[PDB]
């Protein structure tokens, strides 16, 4: 019952003819799956460890110049020569300074001058790369029925942790009283590692784009260096001064840590103090409900009295969780829980904690249910001692549908075509929508890559105006539709 | 001459004593006594709260975090009064005499 | 404008419009930096911690 507290919780209801459902386990989001006659399960992606990343490129963010030297030639005598020019760790530049009799030359003109200073690196930002091979996810599956505590079992916990690495596609988790859940996850397509750099500057690490990382204008080493002195592109971290065309000087151009922090705007930070832990990105899995059994089936109904040990609480997703304790005979029995209307003539509310049961006499099992909008009754127990607890659900139905549509749009924005594999059970509409989304998303990524959200909004407004003014209505509708989607993406981007 | 500093800018800061205070949902924003200390930088946000977190209500709980801001390096912007400029000029007669 | 070991002659409005923490210049103690938020970042991912 982890998902209760999480604001980003999605309810996936239904399984295919084969009793499988595919889901996307995003980081920081909890998924709860409800299937008829099936235990309700809570899936959370809690970790993404990338192991043994190989260094790709070292960048210099803070250098220091030393051993500065200068050589001059009299005018018309070519360029001077510095022995330090042969060495590649000296940054050198050629310029011309006015010469004459006063400065020791027999000709009045511009003589060549060369300034060389030894370039040294104080701080560098390694950028490492991982191959999907050593990309190990971690998922927690918690049987959503029971009581939500991690101290019930000394050896472990009620929830199970399964590590989804690319080596094994099938990961099978055995729940103590619920059978086994099978996840056929696909780690290779979750996040496009090997098109992505694990940038690590000092004690902070990010997850940057490989092309962006390789386009950074800083001194860099290949990444396989051992001496670590032959920096490439040194002149990006050095200034040469020839102020009055009289002498030339070279300065080190300060430290680039803060500028790099500003540059990393828009990159999701990660952890590298131990193991290169990533807490971002999604994962696509298929659920195997076939071997999942309800924990408390083949119990007799509880006929005793029930008391509410915890006041009914309205969870953020429109459900209610109530903790009740059983005081009656027949310890291991199944709780009679119902949600009806004010006349007690209909069962209006659905039960998220399907098949609530009393495992132990003195154990406060907690129940999550979805009541209907408006006034209702939460009834627990049989008629002698049955609890009627009135509830009012604050919202409306149409508002909930609007919210669900907006949530689906936000999923289509955060995720790519995977938004079509979040709730799908196969089917031609899902497949066709996914294919069309793939085509339009390829076109949109080609068109809008590397553009800020402000530019996306500007382009959306421009396209909307063009469509609004188009004389052909087919083109007009298409253009306004594209512009509206572009505006929405601009508003929702910068997540 | 006689430049007077008008402003010091911090170019390399440091955060040392981080403290945080959390409030349960529908109870408003929390309070830190460091929040009205001027040498502390603070920010208010909302974190998910619930039974696991220890609240008893399900919603967004106000959160505040504060760290002490310390400057390790600064850049002094100085100003000079126009009366304090002293230009130096050299007048050499183009005579042809040697040193 | 004197930074660490180097100095520049800069416009005064440009200098007063820089996005960095600043003391008024008469503060010997340096315990009241202004605009401290331009040199720190507050991160709240997943709405779980800050």
């Amino acid at each position, epitope marked *: 019952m982890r998902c209760i507290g999480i604001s980003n919780r999605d309810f996936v209801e239904g399984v295919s003819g084969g009793s499988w459902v595919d889901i996307v386990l995003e980081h920081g989001s909890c998924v709860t799956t409800m299937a008829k006659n099936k235990p309700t399960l809570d899936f*959370e992606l*809690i*970790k993404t460890e990338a192991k043994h990343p190989a260094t790709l490129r070292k960048y210099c963010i803070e250098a220091k110049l030393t051993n500065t030297t200068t050589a001059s030639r009299c005018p018309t005598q070519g360029e001077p020569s510095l022995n330090e020019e042969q060495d590649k760790r000296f940054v050198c530049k050629h310029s011309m300074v006015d010469r004459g009799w006063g400065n020791g030359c027999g000709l009045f003109g511009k003589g060549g001058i060369v300034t060389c200073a030894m370039f040294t690196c104080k701080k560098n930002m390694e950028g490492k790369i991982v191959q999907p091979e050593n990309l190990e996810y971690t998922i*927690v599956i918690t049987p959503h029925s029971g009581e939500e*505590n*991690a*101290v*019930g079992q*000394d050896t472990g916990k009620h929830g199970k942790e399964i590590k989804v690495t690319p080596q094994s596609s099938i990961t099978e988790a055995e729940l103590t009283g619920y059978g086994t859940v099978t996840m056929e996850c696909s780690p290779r397509t979750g996040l496009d590692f090997n098109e992505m750099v694990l940038l690590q500057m000092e004690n902070k690490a990010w997850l940057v784009h490989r092309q962006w990382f390789l386009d950074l204008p800083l001194p860099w080493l290949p990444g396989a260096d051992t001496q670590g002195s032959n920096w490439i592109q040194k002149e990006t971290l050095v200034t040469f001064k020839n102020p009055h065309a009289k002498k030339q000087d070279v300065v080190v151009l300060g430290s680039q840590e803060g500028a790099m922090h500003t540059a990393l705007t828009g990159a999701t930070e990660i952890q590298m*103090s*131990s193991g290169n*832990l990533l*807490f971002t990105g999604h994962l696509k899995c298929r659920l195997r409900m076939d071997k999942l059994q309800l924990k408390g089936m083949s119990y007799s109904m509880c006929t005793g009295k029930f008391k509410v*040990v915890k006041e009914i609480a309205e969870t953020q997703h429109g459900t209610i969780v109530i903790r009740v304790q059983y005081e009656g005979d027949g310890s291991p029995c199944k709780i009679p829980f119902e949600i009806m209307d004010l006349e007690k003539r209909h069962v209006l509310g659905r039960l998220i904690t399907v098949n609530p049961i009393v495992t132990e006499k*003195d154990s*406060p099992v907690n129940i999550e249910a979805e009541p209907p909008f408006g006034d209702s009754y939460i009834i627990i127990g049989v008629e002698p001692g049955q609890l009627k607890l009135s509830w009012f659900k604050k919202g409306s139905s149409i508002g909930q549908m609007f919210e669900t549509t907006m949530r689906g749009a936000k999923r289509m924005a955060i995720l790519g075509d995977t938004a079509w594999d979040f709730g799908s059970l196969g089917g031609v509409f899902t497949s066709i929508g996914k294919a069309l989304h793939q085509v339009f998303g390829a076109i949109y990524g080609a068109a809008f890559s590397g553009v800020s959200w402000t530019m996306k909004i500007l382009i959306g407004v421009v396209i909307t105006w063009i469509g609004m003014n188009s004389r052909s209505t087919s083109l007009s509708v298409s253009l306004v539709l594209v512009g509206v989607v572009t505006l929405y993406l601009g508003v929702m981007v910068q997540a | 001459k006689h430049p007077a500093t008008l402003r010091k800018y911090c170019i390399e800061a440091k955060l040392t004593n981080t*403290t*945080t*205070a*959390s*409030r*349960c949902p529908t*109870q408003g924003e*929390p309070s*830190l006594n460091e929040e009205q200390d001027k040498r502390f930088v603070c920010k208010h946000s909302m*974190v998910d709260r619930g*039974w*696991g*977190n*220890g*609240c*008893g209500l399900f919603g967004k709980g106000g959160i505040v975090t504060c760290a002490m801001f310390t400057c390790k390096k600064n850049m002094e912007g100085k100003i000079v009064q126009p009366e304090n400029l002293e230009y130096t000029i050299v007048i050499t007669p183009h005579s042809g005499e040697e040193n | 404008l004197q930074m660490e070991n180097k100095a520049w002659l800069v416009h005064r409005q440009w200098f007063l419009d820089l996005p960095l923490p600043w003391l008024p210049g008469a503060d010997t103690q340096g315990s009241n930096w202004i605009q401290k938020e331009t040199l720190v970042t507050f991160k709240n991912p997943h709405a*779980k*911690k800050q």
Partner: antibody
Amino acid sequence: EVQLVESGAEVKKPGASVKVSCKASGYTFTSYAMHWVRQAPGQRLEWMGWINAGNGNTKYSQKFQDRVTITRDTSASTAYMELSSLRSEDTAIYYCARDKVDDYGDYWFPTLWYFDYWGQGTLVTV
Amino acid sequence: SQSALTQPASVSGSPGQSITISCTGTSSDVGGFNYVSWFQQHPGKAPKLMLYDVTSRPSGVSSRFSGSKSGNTASLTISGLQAEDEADYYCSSHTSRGTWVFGGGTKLTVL
């Protein structure tokens, strides 16, 4: 289940440096965060602070935030609490407890059973 | 910080009866957060967690121990006092500032 064994009682002169280890077995050390509780003989339990074994993050009490330092070994499977400036008030038995951190290694909010397991106790008479 | 947790210094009850221990604290820790935990400490023994939540208790602990919290006060209720209930009981809470406050402690003595 899980077991935590603290060190033997130490009698020290006031002002000396104290260091008492609490090796905890039966569970992933870096998974849980280990707290330190002090109780003067004949007085209440008194919370010093916690050290997270996952990443070394620590928190000390207002009272102890100057002379009290907590460090742990991930490999040695032990966490150490050291008191800097000893005093007669500091003559108490110091108890090490444990609380599990979240799935992300952070220790923002504790588990409701935040002191489910303790140590037998180490007595220091300053 | 400070022992905001204030509970009766001395408590006694006849064997077999029901005795309650009340722990009071500020609205920061015990009035706002359900982290009220009750710990029993025997002579020369380390504290043992009795109720980790306001009312929840560990597997080992018997069901005679039941807690409650109303307003800023937390109450430990023991039903059917035995001769093995003569230990001290320390309430604790997770303060809103992230610290831990223990109660003064109640020494239970049975007649």
